[PDB]
Amino acid sequence: DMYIERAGDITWEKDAEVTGNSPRLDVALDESGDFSLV
Amino acid sequence: ETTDGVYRVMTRRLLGSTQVGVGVMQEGVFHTMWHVTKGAALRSGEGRLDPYWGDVKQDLVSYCGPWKLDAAWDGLSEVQLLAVPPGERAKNIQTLPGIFKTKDGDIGAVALDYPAGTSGSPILDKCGRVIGLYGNGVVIKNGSYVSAITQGKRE
Ligand SMILES: N=C(N)N[C@H]1CCCCNC(=O)[C@H](CCCCN)NC(=O)[C@H](CCCCN)NC(=O)Cc2ccc(cc2)CNC(=O)CCCNC1=O
């Protein structure tokens, strides 16, 4: 049995650290809900 | 508890208490990814949340009602992943989405790597609206993870 517990509000953080790049990928989505690269 | 916000999804079928994912409560509906719960019933303290809508292909599921989140990446702005990693506090990470280009159209994607139990963490726009959930994506040449910004359809 799974249960849920609250972890915070849904809010923009002005003082957030910024990371991660922005790749453009060509992908396929199969019937099982999985993305694959092409 | 049905207060709006971000929630951990926990199980005890394994060792100790394990976080299997994350979800968003909004307007009395709990939203998460299909692969987190596989459509299973959930417990909130003394109450019970049962599934209302789900789709494996989208990898989303809603509890107590229909999908309520309808905001979308404006295209241009940077976004924030409100990551809730297992055993760690909720943390905002700001990033500029990349793009998954499919035969069916383009989807924003975030190149951020978190443990599997972070699946379901909301991505938000600057005005605070949830524009999708994290945790369904690909692993690319270098070996790091890129998650789609996975959003449902309201009404
Ligand atoms: N860094 C990662 N790769 N994952 C992160 C978590 C990813 C975010 C959570 N979301 C998922 O786990 C979904 C659940 C299925 C959604 C249902 N449709 N899975 C995915 O999106 C993709 C889809 C495959 C597409 C190819 N056809 N599956 C994987 O990446 C498997 C995997 C391959 C390699 C590894 C770990 C996992 C290597 N370990 C690590 O690097 C660090 C170990 C811990 N950190 C992780 O595990």
mmCIF file of C-alpha atoms and ligand atoms in Angstrom:
data_model
loop_
_atom_site.group_PDB
_atom_site.id
_atom_site.type_symbol
_atom_site.label_atom_id
_atom_site.label_comp_id
_atom_site.label_asym_id
_atom_site.label_seq_id
_atom_site.Cartn_x
_atom_site.Cartn_y
_atom_site.Cartn_z
ATOM 1 C CA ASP A 1 0.000 0.000 0.000
ATOM 2 C CA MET A 2 1.317 3.372 -1.149
ATOM 3 C CA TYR A 3 0.706 6.568 0.785
ATOM 4 C CA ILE A 4 1.441 10.231 0.140
ATOM 5 C CA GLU A 5 2.950 12.887 2.390
ATOM 6 C CA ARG A 6 3.136 16.620 1.781
ATOM 7 C CA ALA A 7 6.542 18.054 0.858
ATOM 8 C CA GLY A 8 5.883 21.724 0.097
ATOM 9 C CA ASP A 9 4.061 24.469 -1.747
ATOM 10 C CA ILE A 10 4.119 24.919 -5.525
ATOM 11 C CA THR A 11 6.046 28.183 -5.874
ATOM 12 C CA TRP A 12 8.652 29.868 -8.044
ATOM 13 C CA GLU A 13 11.928 30.415 -6.199
ATOM 14 C CA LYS A 14 13.533 33.768 -7.081
ATOM 15 C CA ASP A 15 16.832 32.589 -5.553
ATOM 16 C CA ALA A 16 17.022 29.289 -7.440
ATOM 17 C CA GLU A 17 20.265 27.854 -8.740
ATOM 18 C CA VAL A 18 20.297 27.564 -12.540
ATOM 19 C CA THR A 19 21.805 24.579 -14.337
ATOM 20 C CA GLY A 20 21.174 22.116 -17.145
ATOM 21 C CA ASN A 21 21.509 22.685 -20.892
ATOM 22 C CA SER A 22 18.740 22.666 -23.544
ATOM 23 C CA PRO A 23 19.250 19.830 -26.038
ATOM 24 C CA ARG A 24 17.099 19.298 -29.105
ATOM 25 C CA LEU A 25 16.496 15.553 -29.563
ATOM 26 C CA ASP A 26 14.511 13.609 -32.148
ATOM 27 C CA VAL A 27 12.605 10.968 -30.191
ATOM 28 C CA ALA A 28 9.854 8.396 -30.715
ATOM 29 C CA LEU A 29 7.097 7.595 -28.217
ATOM 30 C CA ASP A 30 6.011 3.950 -28.267
ATOM 31 C CA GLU A 31 2.678 2.437 -27.210
ATOM 32 C CA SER A 32 4.160 1.527 -23.795
ATOM 33 C CA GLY A 33 4.820 5.210 -22.937
ATOM 34 C CA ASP A 34 8.608 5.027 -23.349
ATOM 35 C CA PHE A 35 10.666 7.583 -25.263
ATOM 36 C CA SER A 36 13.455 6.424 -27.539
ATOM 37 C CA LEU A 37 16.149 8.374 -29.344
ATOM 38 C CA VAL A 38 16.295 8.279 -33.140
ATOM 39 C CA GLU B 1 -4.681 15.942 3.628
ATOM 40 C CA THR B 2 -5.878 17.412 0.311
ATOM 41 C CA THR B 3 -4.064 20.763 0.629
ATOM 42 C CA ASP B 4 -2.599 21.953 -2.684
ATOM 43 C CA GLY B 5 1.110 21.300 -2.965
ATOM 44 C CA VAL B 6 3.744 18.727 -3.815
ATOM 45 C CA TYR B 7 3.639 15.301 -2.158
ATOM 46 C CA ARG B 8 5.917 12.311 -1.795
ATOM 47 C CA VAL B 9 4.573 8.919 -2.855
ATOM 48 C CA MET B 10 5.858 6.332 -0.378
ATOM 49 C CA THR B 11 5.627 2.543 -0.152
ATOM 50 C CA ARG B 12 6.431 -0.039 2.507
ATOM 51 C CA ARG B 13 6.385 -3.129 0.273
ATOM 52 C CA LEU B 14 10.203 -2.916 0.290
ATOM 53 C CA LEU B 15 12.883 -2.281 2.897
ATOM 54 C CA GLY B 16 11.980 0.536 5.278
ATOM 55 C CA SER B 17 9.856 3.284 3.772
ATOM 56 C CA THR B 18 10.753 3.922 0.132
ATOM 57 C CA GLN B 19 9.840 6.949 -1.954
ATOM 58 C CA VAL B 20 8.685 5.673 -5.334
ATOM 59 C CA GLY B 21 7.686 9.063 -6.753
ATOM 60 C CA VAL B 22 6.151 12.514 -6.414
ATOM 61 C CA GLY B 23 2.824 14.143 -7.166
ATOM 62 C CA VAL B 24 0.925 17.410 -7.294
ATOM 63 C CA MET B 25 -2.286 18.130 -5.396
ATOM 64 C CA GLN B 26 -4.392 20.835 -7.050
ATOM 65 C CA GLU B 27 -8.128 21.554 -6.829
ATOM 66 C CA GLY B 28 -8.674 18.349 -4.844
ATOM 67 C CA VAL B 29 -7.045 16.060 -7.447
ATOM 68 C CA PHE B 30 -3.739 14.228 -7.052
ATOM 69 C CA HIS B 31 -1.610 14.128 -10.210
ATOM 70 C CA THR B 32 1.369 11.873 -10.783
ATOM 71 C CA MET B 33 3.015 9.717 -13.422
ATOM 72 C CA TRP B 34 1.603 6.323 -14.318
ATOM 73 C CA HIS B 35 4.852 4.460 -13.749
ATOM 74 C CA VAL B 36 4.986 5.683 -10.145
ATOM 75 C CA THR B 37 1.759 4.054 -8.939
ATOM 76 C CA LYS B 38 0.743 1.913 -11.948
ATOM 77 C CA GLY B 39 -2.807 3.079 -11.298
ATOM 78 C CA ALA B 40 -2.884 1.732 -7.734
ATOM 79 C CA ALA B 41 -4.987 3.161 -4.904
ATOM 80 C CA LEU B 42 -3.261 5.595 -2.557
ATOM 81 C CA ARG B 43 -3.657 6.420 1.125
ATOM 82 C CA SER B 44 -3.676 9.928 2.594
ATOM 83 C CA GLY B 45 -3.588 9.517 6.357
ATOM 84 C CA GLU B 46 -7.000 8.074 7.168
ATOM 85 C CA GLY B 47 -8.518 8.690 3.732
ATOM 86 C CA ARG B 48 -8.280 6.811 0.444
ATOM 87 C CA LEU B 49 -7.529 8.202 -3.027
ATOM 88 C CA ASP B 50 -8.653 6.002 -5.875
ATOM 89 C CA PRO B 51 -7.727 6.396 -9.539
ATOM 90 C CA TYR B 52 -9.963 8.503 -11.740
ATOM 91 C CA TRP B 53 -8.100 8.836 -15.053
ATOM 92 C CA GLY B 54 -4.913 7.286 -16.443
ATOM 93 C CA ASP B 55 -3.044 6.687 -19.698
ATOM 94 C CA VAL B 56 0.112 4.590 -19.990
ATOM 95 C CA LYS B 57 1.118 6.221 -23.272
ATOM 96 C CA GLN B 58 1.109 9.681 -21.696
ATOM 97 C CA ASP B 59 2.493 8.128 -18.456
ATOM 98 C CA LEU B 60 0.064 10.153 -16.275
ATOM 99 C CA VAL B 61 -2.663 9.319 -13.763
ATOM 100 C CA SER B 62 -5.130 11.408 -11.729
ATOM 101 C CA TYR B 63 -6.821 10.605 -8.416
ATOM 102 C CA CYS B 64 -10.210 11.779 -7.080
ATOM 103 C CA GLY B 65 -11.015 13.562 -10.359
ATOM 104 C CA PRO B 66 -9.936 14.596 -13.851
ATOM 105 C CA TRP B 67 -6.557 16.055 -14.786
ATOM 106 C CA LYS B 68 -6.523 19.687 -13.620
ATOM 107 C CA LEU B 69 -3.119 20.973 -14.813
ATOM 108 C CA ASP B 70 -3.344 22.816 -18.148
ATOM 109 C CA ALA B 71 -0.506 25.373 -18.190
ATOM 110 C CA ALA B 72 2.220 24.870 -20.777
ATOM 111 C CA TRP B 73 5.757 25.966 -21.495
ATOM 112 C CA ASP B 74 5.317 29.388 -23.049
ATOM 113 C CA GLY B 75 8.037 28.283 -25.409
ATOM 114 C CA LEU B 76 10.486 30.964 -24.418
ATOM 115 C CA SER B 77 10.941 31.334 -20.659
ATOM 116 C CA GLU B 78 13.242 29.418 -18.383
ATOM 117 C CA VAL B 79 11.387 27.055 -15.996
ATOM 118 C CA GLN B 80 11.932 25.474 -12.578
ATOM 119 C CA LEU B 81 11.927 21.834 -11.542
ATOM 120 C CA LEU B 82 10.566 21.592 -8.007
ATOM 121 C CA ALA B 83 12.556 18.450 -7.325
ATOM 122 C CA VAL B 84 11.570 16.358 -4.314
ATOM 123 C CA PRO B 85 14.348 13.739 -4.115
ATOM 124 C CA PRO B 86 13.893 10.797 -1.735
ATOM 125 C CA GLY B 87 14.871 11.655 1.844
ATOM 126 C CA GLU B 88 15.834 15.178 0.792
ATOM 127 C CA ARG B 89 14.014 18.488 0.959
ATOM 128 C CA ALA B 90 12.111 19.968 -1.931
ATOM 129 C CA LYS B 91 14.410 22.130 -4.017
ATOM 130 C CA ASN B 92 13.807 24.461 -6.972
ATOM 131 C CA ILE B 93 16.156 24.080 -9.958
ATOM 132 C CA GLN B 94 15.976 26.630 -12.764
ATOM 133 C CA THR B 95 16.720 25.560 -16.310
ATOM 134 C CA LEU B 96 16.023 26.374 -19.943
ATOM 135 C CA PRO B 97 14.111 23.475 -21.514
ATOM 136 C CA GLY B 98 15.375 21.718 -24.584
ATOM 137 C CA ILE B 99 12.947 20.164 -27.054
ATOM 138 C CA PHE B 100 11.784 16.643 -27.871
ATOM 139 C CA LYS B 101 10.835 16.779 -31.553
ATOM 140 C CA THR B 102 8.441 13.951 -32.385
ATOM 141 C CA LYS B 103 6.443 13.027 -35.458
ATOM 142 C CA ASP B 104 3.438 14.343 -33.487
ATOM 143 C CA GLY B 105 4.976 17.708 -32.531
ATOM 144 C CA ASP B 106 7.456 19.248 -30.133
ATOM 145 C CA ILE B 107 7.583 18.855 -26.350
ATOM 146 C CA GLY B 108 9.778 20.782 -23.950
ATOM 147 C CA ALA B 109 12.363 18.690 -22.157
ATOM 148 C CA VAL B 110 14.594 19.312 -19.122
ATOM 149 C CA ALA B 111 18.168 18.012 -18.894
ATOM 150 C CA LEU B 112 18.238 17.340 -15.142
ATOM 151 C CA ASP B 113 19.229 14.053 -13.499
ATOM 152 C CA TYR B 114 17.594 13.004 -10.220
ATOM 153 C CA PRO B 115 16.978 9.607 -8.592
ATOM 154 C CA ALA B 116 14.136 7.515 -9.929
ATOM 155 C CA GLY B 117 11.989 8.260 -6.882
ATOM 156 C CA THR B 118 11.859 11.876 -8.032
ATOM 157 C CA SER B 119 9.449 10.951 -10.869
ATOM 158 C CA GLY B 120 6.328 13.111 -10.635
ATOM 159 C CA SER B 121 8.069 16.300 -9.490
ATOM 160 C CA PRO B 122 6.357 19.372 -10.977
ATOM 161 C CA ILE B 123 7.957 21.699 -13.511
ATOM 162 C CA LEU B 124 6.641 25.258 -13.151
ATOM 163 C CA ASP B 125 6.580 28.467 -15.158
ATOM 164 C CA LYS B 126 7.441 31.859 -13.697
ATOM 165 C CA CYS B 127 3.848 32.612 -12.686
ATOM 166 C CA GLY B 128 3.892 29.469 -10.467
ATOM 167 C CA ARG B 129 1.749 27.215 -12.706
ATOM 168 C CA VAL B 130 2.602 23.512 -13.129
ATOM 169 C CA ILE B 131 3.454 22.995 -16.804
ATOM 170 C CA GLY B 132 4.143 19.275 -16.528
ATOM 171 C CA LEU B 133 5.723 16.495 -14.501
ATOM 172 C CA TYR B 134 9.289 15.170 -14.571
ATOM 173 C CA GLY B 135 10.572 11.643 -14.951
ATOM 174 C CA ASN B 136 9.705 10.265 -18.409
ATOM 175 C CA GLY B 137 12.480 10.721 -20.953
ATOM 176 C CA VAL B 138 15.606 9.314 -22.628
ATOM 177 C CA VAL B 139 19.295 8.752 -21.926
ATOM 178 C CA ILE B 140 21.475 10.285 -24.613
ATOM 179 C CA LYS B 141 24.996 9.768 -25.970
ATOM 180 C CA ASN B 142 26.848 11.080 -22.878
ATOM 181 C CA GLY B 143 24.690 8.905 -20.600
ATOM 182 C CA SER B 144 22.820 11.597 -18.709
ATOM 183 C CA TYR B 145 19.052 11.906 -18.537
ATOM 184 C CA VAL B 146 16.662 14.241 -20.370
ATOM 185 C CA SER B 147 13.054 14.241 -19.161
ATOM 186 C CA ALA B 148 10.076 15.355 -21.194
ATOM 187 C CA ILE B 149 7.892 18.071 -19.689
ATOM 188 C CA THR B 150 4.885 15.704 -19.526
ATOM 189 C CA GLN B 151 1.496 17.465 -19.388
ATOM 190 C CA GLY B 152 -2.078 16.238 -19.624
ATOM 191 C CA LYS B 153 -5.221 17.655 -21.227
ATOM 192 C CA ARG B 154 -7.774 19.438 -19.017
ATOM 193 C CA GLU B 155 -11.503 18.674 -19.388
HETATM 194 N N1 LIG C 1 20.178 8.829 -15.084
HETATM 195 C C1 LIG C 1 19.083 7.965 -15.528
HETATM 196 N N2 LIG C 1 19.163 7.388 -16.636
HETATM 197 N N3 LIG C 1 17.889 7.765 -14.707
HETATM 198 C C2 LIG C 1 17.768 8.404 -13.423
HETATM 199 C C3 LIG C 1 16.276 8.605 -13.112
HETATM 200 C C4 LIG C 1 15.501 9.136 -14.328
HETATM 201 C C5 LIG C 1 14.340 10.018 -13.781
HETATM 202 C C6 LIG C 1 13.226 9.073 -13.252
HETATM 203 N N4 LIG C 1 12.489 8.518 -14.395
HETATM 204 C C7 LIG C 1 12.576 7.099 -14.749
HETATM 205 O O1 LIG C 1 13.253 6.356 -14.118
HETATM 206 C C8 LIG C 1 11.803 6.572 -15.950
HETATM 207 C C9 LIG C 1 10.847 5.464 -15.523
HETATM 208 C C10 LIG C 1 10.223 4.823 -16.770
HETATM 209 C C11 LIG C 1 9.162 5.744 -17.386
HETATM 210 C C12 LIG C 1 8.030 4.900 -17.993
HETATM 211 N N5 LIG C 1 7.935 5.125 -19.432
HETATM 212 N N6 LIG C 1 12.751 6.028 -16.917
HETATM 213 C C13 LIG C 1 13.162 6.819 -18.091
HETATM 214 O O2 LIG C 1 12.718 7.910 -18.260
HETATM 215 C C14 LIG C 1 14.157 6.208 -19.095
HETATM 216 C C15 LIG C 1 13.386 5.755 -20.327
HETATM 217 C C16 LIG C 1 14.308 4.884 -21.176
HETATM 218 C C17 LIG C 1 14.304 5.431 -22.602
HETATM 219 C C18 LIG C 1 15.128 4.526 -23.514
HETATM 220 N N7 LIG C 1 14.245 3.731 -24.358
HETATM 221 N N8 LIG C 1 14.758 5.024 -18.530
HETATM 222 C C19 LIG C 1 16.130 5.012 -18.019
HETATM 223 O O3 LIG C 1 16.804 5.999 -18.044
HETATM 224 C C20 LIG C 1 16.675 3.686 -17.430
HETATM 225 C C21 LIG C 1 18.036 3.948 -16.767
HETATM 226 C C22 LIG C 1 19.191 3.838 -17.524
HETATM 227 C C23 LIG C 1 20.424 4.070 -16.921
HETATM 228 C C24 LIG C 1 20.488 4.412 -15.573
HETATM 229 C C25 LIG C 1 19.329 4.522 -14.816
HETATM 230 C C26 LIG C 1 18.101 4.288 -15.417
HETATM 231 C C27 LIG C 1 21.848 4.667 -14.927
HETATM 232 N N9 LIG C 1 21.679 5.203 -13.577
HETATM 233 C C28 LIG C 1 22.055 6.590 -13.300
HETATM 234 O O4 LIG C 1 22.488 7.268 -14.172
HETATM 235 C C29 LIG C 1 21.892 7.164 -11.884
HETATM 236 C C30 LIG C 1 21.067 6.204 -11.016
HETATM 237 C C31 LIG C 1 19.866 6.953 -10.431
HETATM 238 N N10 LIG C 1 19.341 7.888 -11.414
HETATM 239 C C32 LIG C 1 18.342 7.446 -12.379
HETATM 240 O O5 LIG C 1 17.960 6.321 -12.359
#
